[PDB]
Amino acid sequence: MKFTVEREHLLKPLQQVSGPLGGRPTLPILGNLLLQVADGTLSLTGTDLEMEMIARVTLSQPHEAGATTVPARKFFDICRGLPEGAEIAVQLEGDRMLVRSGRSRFSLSTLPAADFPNLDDWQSEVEFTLPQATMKRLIEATQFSMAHQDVRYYLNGMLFETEGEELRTVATDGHRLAVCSMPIGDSLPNHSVIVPRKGVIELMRMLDGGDTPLRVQIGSNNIRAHVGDFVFTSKLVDGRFPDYRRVLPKNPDKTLEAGCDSLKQAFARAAILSNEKFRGVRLYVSENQIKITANNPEQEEAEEILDVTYAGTEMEIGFNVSYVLDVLNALKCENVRILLTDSVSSVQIEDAASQSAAYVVMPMR
Amino acid sequence: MKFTVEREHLLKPLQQVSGLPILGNLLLQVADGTLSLTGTDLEMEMIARVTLSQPHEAGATTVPARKFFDICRGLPEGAEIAVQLEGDRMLVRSGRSRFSLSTLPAADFPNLDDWQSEVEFTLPQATMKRLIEATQFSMAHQDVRYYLNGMLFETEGEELRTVATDGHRLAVCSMPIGDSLPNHSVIVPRKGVIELMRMLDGGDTPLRVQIGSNNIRAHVGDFVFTSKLVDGRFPDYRRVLPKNPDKTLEAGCDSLKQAFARAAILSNEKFRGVRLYVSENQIKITANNPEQEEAEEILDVTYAGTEMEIGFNVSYVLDVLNALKCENVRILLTDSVSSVQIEDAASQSAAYVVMPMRL
């Protein structure tokens, strides 16, 4: 293996295949990057066991075929550390890989290419192609509601559900829920799969909001995403995801509407004097006003009052302020509509102007 | 105590004073036309003063600093904040937002400001900032020789000098001041140096500094900073500087830095060993690790002396080069087992000493 490639052309791909954390990986090879030369193409591959990213770059200069693995982070830093404009001459020499540029010489350790795991050896069953914007909309709309280190491992992921013309995402930690749907334009067979946390994070990192369409392939145990010269593949979590339609409020008698930003700032201010552990906040509902209250064990008190329009009977409801905030921060719109039934039941939250995303939050006290 | 003050006028001071129970609180005090906000810890106490253009009533109390700051920050741009003491509680009102905070009584709030100055001098913020930035990185961190964890401020005639050093390396910086003072050296602790840096906005407002036998105070505008000093015999910087360095090497700071940084990647992660071969108008930099990965850099420099190999921890050199931020560096070398001085080629005001390594 021998290639010579300009520094800024090699730097972008290396970034794209870079691991989220170089540190703390028990398996030695997982810390390495697989370099492979074929006719006119250099392929850089990074991987943990769960997922794998592959970047391809066309070689305009002399090259010779071969493959090897070298420590990814060291290799990245050496290229980054080289001056703007540099030509990087890589060459395999037995045990070592050599990197040469200007008057700088580097000798790296290797592990053999054939011990490098291949997590992209499966057959796709369903394929669709959509704009990056739409996948980004779906992931951002729900990602915050994913569980963290929950014993029901499937909750730690996000559900991608195709249903006819729509692609739907669902995330839920069991105390709250997010669901988002967007039409994708070609009718698909009904199919739902669970993508793990790190997969969702990587899938978001791909999407630059470019004009390049995103090609998505789904297998029975794996999922692959194409954007331009970059391919991302990940394993699928195996679990029985909970039905989102069961968690949505059955019959919500009362409806409350207000400005998202004003409601957010008011919740945020009250949250300062909420119990640091449980973050409970009381919501007092009146026909023309909502009163937000918070106190802590030291009996410090917060009180906000806003002008809202609300058709229903008056009531008190207890909420975790953080969950509401996560929801209001996710909406980023003009007006929010809250649907409530009673003090002991769940409450739906949504943008008043769009039905495409819904949020369900559990009550307190 | 009652005051009403515009949000953006209260926000800057609160920031300035930000930093067991009562130490978490902020002391608010009203006098004729003035609100004083004080933040403190058993080491350093710092004060902000703001003039009140609106109705007020005198009094004092303490309230949790962080909560009080967040409530003001959290209020909308342009807001009028009405504070009022009500028995056990302090009340904060703006628009239809209302907050009741816990208090602890003003008279339990510790005071670190009662002491007599012995030496007073005034200088520009730029100069103090130059002195602190030039050496701060060389301060020790959590060392058992506790005095090393600080920085030395030494007055010597017409100059103010800072020195920072761990056992391994050293930084010294000197900057002239207008009035000749008596010889005096004191050790400001880590958190003091950090706060002193925080004060300096690079404004035209002169900085007034007062030194007592066990404390130091700094005045900039309406902001006052005071800290305990560290007790200890700080080592003599003049003993560590190379005595008579025959060999002098000159290089471009940035090129030397990037080359040392690239080699450092394949240095031993624990000891950071790096070898420097110096020869006629050239340096060769070398590094290897336990896995026998190797790095090698060569640069055009200017060097006329005898040829030698010398080794140093690369972090220490990089830290120095990163601190210099200049066009060219002069390195003063004596031999392979001796320490080496580093300085900006264009200014003698800051010197850096780094020891050798037998690889």
CATH topology of domain A1-123: DNA Polymerase III; Chain A, domain 2 (3.10.150)
Surface-to-core class of residue B111, CB atoms within 10 Å of its CB (0-12 exposed, 13-18 middle, 19+ buried):
exposed
Residues of A in contact with B266 (CB under 8 A): 74, 106-107
Which three-class secondary structure state does DSSP give residue B135? helix
Question: Are B182 and B119 spatial neighbours (Cβ–Cβ below 8 Å)?
Answer: yes
CATH topology of domain B117-240: DNA Polymerase III; Chain A, domain 2 (3.10.150)
| Domain locations along chain B | 1-116, 117-240, 241-359
Same-fold call for B1-116 versus B117-240: yes
The secondary structure element, H or E, covering residue B263 is: helix B253-264
Partners of B89 in beta bridges: B86, B102
* Complete edge-to-edge strand list for the sheet that includes strand A214-218: A66-71, A32-38, A41-47, A51-58, A230-235, A222-227, A214-218, A126-130
Buried b / exposed e along A329-356 (16+ C-beta atoms within 10 A):
ebbebebbbbbbbeeeebbbbbbbeeeb
CA A67 to chain B, closest CA, distance in angstroms equals 19
CA distances from B90 to B50, B62, B323 (A): 19, 9, 46
CA pair distance B98, B349, nearest whole angstrom: 55
Taking the Cβ of residue B73 and every Cβ of chain A, the question of whether any pair is shorter than 8 Å is answered with no
**Domain A124-247 in CATH: superfamily?**
DNA Polymerase III, subunit A, domain 2 (3.10.150.10)
Taking CA–CA distances from B297, the nearest residue in chain A reads: A104
Residue type, B106: A
CA B91 to chain A, closest CA, distance in angstroms equals 10
Q: Kindly report the backbone phi and psi dihedral angles of residue A91, in degrees, each rounded to the nearest multiple of 5, phi listed first.
A: -155, 135
Residues of A in contact with B314 (CB under 8 A): none
**Which among B70, B71, B265 is the nearest to A77, CB-wise?**
B265
CATH 3.10.150.10 fits A248-365, yes or no: yes
Taking the Cβ of residue B131 and every Cβ of chain A, the question of whether any pair is shorter than 8 Å is answered with no
Q: Is A306 close to B96, i.e. CB distance below 8 A?
A: yes
Size of interface A-B (CB pairs under 8 A): 79
CA A127 to chain centre: 20
**Which among A104, A300, A303 is the nearest to B101, CB-wise?**
A300
Taking the Cβ of residue B291 and every Cβ of chain A, the question of whether any pair is shorter than 8 Å is answered with yes
Taking the Cβ of residue B260 and every Cβ of chain A, the question of whether any pair is shorter than 8 Å is answered with no
CA distances from A148 to A143, A168, A179, A201 (A): 11, 21, 17, 13
CA pair distance B23, A180, nearest whole angstrom: 47
Which three-class secondary structure state does DSSP give residue B99? strand
Q: Is B294 close to A107, i.e. CB distance below 8 A?
A: yes
Q: Is B295 close to A106, i.e. CB distance below 8 A?
A: yes
Token pair in block for residue A88: 């990087």
The 3-state secondary structure of chain A reads: CEEEEEHHHHHHHHHHCCCCCCCCCCCCHHHEEEEEEECCEEEEEEECCCEEEEEEEECCCCEECEEEEEEHHHHHHHHHHCCCCCEEEEEEECCEEEEEECCEEEEEECECHHHCCCCCCCCCCEEEEECHHHHHHHHHHHHHHCCCCCCCHHHHCEEEEEEEEEEEEEEECCCEEEEEEEEEEEEEEEEEEEECHHHHHHHHHHCCCCCCCEEEEECCCEEEEEECCEEEEEECECCCCCCHHHHCCCCCCEEEEEEHHHHHHHHHHHHCCCCCCCCEEEEEECCCEEEEEEECCCCCEEEEEEECEEECCCEEEEEEHHHHHHHHHHHCCCEEEEEECCCCCCEEEEECCCCCEEEEECCCC
CA pair distance B201, B227, nearest whole angstrom: 19
Residue type, B66: R
Residues of A in contact with B296 (CB under 8 A): 104-106
CA A77 to chain B, closest CA, distance in angstroms equals 8
CA pair distance A336, A349, nearest whole angstrom: 7
Query: Could you give the angle at which helices B190-199 and B125-135 cross, rounded to 10 degrees?
Result: 140
Question: Are A247 and A172 spatial neighbours (Cβ–Cβ below 8 Å)?
Answer: yes
Question: Are B308 and B246 spatial neighbours (Cβ–Cβ below 8 Å)?
Answer: no
Most B CBs within 10 Å, among A272, A295, A307, to test the B interface? A272
Residues of A in contact with B297 (CB under 8 A): 103-105
Taking the Cβ of residue A273 and every Cβ of chain B, the question of whether any pair is shorter than 8 Å is answered with yes
DSSP state of B191: H
Question: Are A286 and A314 spatial neighbours (Cβ–Cβ below 8 Å)?
Answer: yes
Torsion of the alpha carbons at B298, B300, B305 and B306, rounded to the nearest 10: 30
Taking the Cβ of residue A205 and every Cβ of chain B, the question of whether any pair is shorter than 8 Å is answered with no
Residues of A in contact with B76 (CB under 8 A): 265
What is chain A's length? 365
CA pair distance B313, B340, nearest whole angstrom: 12
Token pair in block for residue A174: 């069991």
DSSP state of B231: P
Question: Are A313 and A343 spatial neighbours (Cβ–Cβ below 8 Å)?
Answer: no
The secondary structure element, H or E, covering residue B131 is: helix B125-135
Residues of B in contact with A104 (CB under 8 A): 259, 262, 295-298
| Tokens 């409601």, residue located | A263
The secondary structure element, H or E, covering residue B197 is: helix B190-199
Find all residues with CB under 8 Å of B144, minimum gap 6, and list them.
none
Residues of B in contact with A106 (CB under 8 A): 262, 265-266, 293-296
Taking the Cβ of residue B100 and every Cβ of chain A, the question of whether any pair is shorter than 8 Å is answered with yes
Q: Kindly report the backbone phi and psi dihedral angles of residue A326, in degrees, each rounded to the nearest multiple of 5, phi listed first.
A: -60, -40
Which three-class secondary structure state does DSSP give residue B101? strand
Residue type, A4: T
Residues of A in contact with B75 (CB under 8 A): 269
CATH architecture of B241-359: Roll (3.10)
| Tokens 């336990």, residue located | B290
Token pair in block for residue B267: 């240095």
Token pair in block for residue A295: 């106190």
Torsion of the alpha carbons at A37, A42, A46 and A49, rounded to the nearest 10: -50
Resolution for this experimental structure (Å): 2.7
Question: Are B184 and B229 spatial neighbours (Cβ–Cβ below 8 Å)?
Answer: no
| Tokens 């005595």, residue located | B243
Partners of A304 in beta bridges: A292, B97
The secondary structure element, H or E, covering residue B275 is: strand B273-279
CA pair distance B173, B161, nearest whole angstrom: 6
Partners of B176 in beta bridges: B159
Q: Cα–Cα–Cα angle for B18, B23, B29, nearest 5°? A: 70
| Residue of B268, B271, B300 whose CA lies nearest to B287 | B268
CA pair distance A159, A195, nearest whole angstrom: 6
| Residue of A279, A300, A266 whose CA lies nearest to B64 | A300
| Residue of B254, B290, B246 whose CA lies nearest to B272 | B290
Q: Is A105 close to B70, i.e. CB distance below 8 A?
A: no
Query: Could you give the angle at which helices A72-81 and A7-16 cross, rounded to 10 degrees?
Result: 150
The CATH code that applies to domain B1-116 is: 3.10.150.10
Which three-class secondary structure state does DSSP give residue B110? coil
Taking the Cβ of residue A107 and every Cβ of chain B, the question of whether any pair is shorter than 8 Å is answered with yes
| Residue of A117, A115, A99, A118 whose CA lies nearest to A107 | A99
Token pair in block for residue B101: 């905070």
CA A292 to chain centre: 32
Q: Measured between alpha carbons, how far apart are the two ends of chain A, in Å?
A: 66
Q: Kindly report the backbone phi and psi dihedral angles of residue B304, in degrees, each rounded to the nearest multiple of 5, phi listed first.
A: -110, -10
Query: Could you give the angle at which helices B65-74 and A260-271 cross, rounded to 10 degrees?
Result: 170
Question: Are A341 and A194 spatial neighbours (Cβ–Cβ below 8 Å)?
Answer: no
Q: Is A105 close to B262, i.e. CB distance below 8 A?
A: no
**Which among B67, B98, B266 is the nearest to A303, CB-wise?**
B98
From its phi and psi, is residue A262 left (phi > 0), alpha (psi between -120 and 50) or beta? alpha
A positions 294-323 inside 8 Å of B (CB): 298-306
